[PDB]
Protein: Beta-xylanase
Amino acid sequence: GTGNGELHDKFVAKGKLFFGTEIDHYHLNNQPLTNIVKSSFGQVTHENSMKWDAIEPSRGRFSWGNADAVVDFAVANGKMIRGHTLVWHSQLPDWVKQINDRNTLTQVIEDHVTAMVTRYKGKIVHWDVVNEIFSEDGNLRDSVFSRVLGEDFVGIAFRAARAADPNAKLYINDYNLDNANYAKVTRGMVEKVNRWVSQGVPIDGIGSQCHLAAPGGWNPASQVPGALRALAGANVKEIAVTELDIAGAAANDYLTVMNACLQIEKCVGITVWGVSDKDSWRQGDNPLLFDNNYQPKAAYHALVNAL
Structure:
């Protein structure tokens, strides 16, 4: 009566756009992994093959194959795609950190942004236009971008993207937005998005990665419902949780995040950052919805039954 029985179809039935997961090309030949993506998730994000150094390793040399493989898989199976990510300080080629002429860095950014967004035009529901640009206290983190251009690289990148694919929602993404009172939320994301939306910058959405700790750690998800409402309170049309994982994978904790999004009008979807704990970037914390044998864990059944 609502798709198959599984997560993304039940989630979407309540009025949301997707419940997706993360994959990359080195998972395409893993059939337990790829069947769960087909049957339980409705959207994918590239884990690594859309980052700057994998896409443009030398200026004007684009290597599209690994990214294309994931995209072909996604569109062949009717999955949405979040593009991740256009401008980031991490895994960033050494040839861009060399440029300090504001013009050339602006050109480089447009070139990079325009190459990616055009190639995948019409196939990409959200682009993380900028990733991780805030310090833990709310100012711009130090990088060739913030040094050379200040806050200006944000509007440079968002405008290049909007110019290249008018259909994609343009997002800003960041981690540690997991407490409403935290500086990075109040003085960082909310304050500066308001200021940049005021200046004509086409920011459609805010992404909260939600790499969350177990109960009693620094960022437990006891507190996320109030943070997402803090974020959803800025002058943007939507928000999403984009890289969700929770150390321990407590049924109660996943329930908390899913229903937080369900109860926030502006929250259009959720992406967990992997299918199985075996392959997670923090496998020690065991933080996903499927175990090492690609069998559904307690949190997974819990979300399906709540829906």
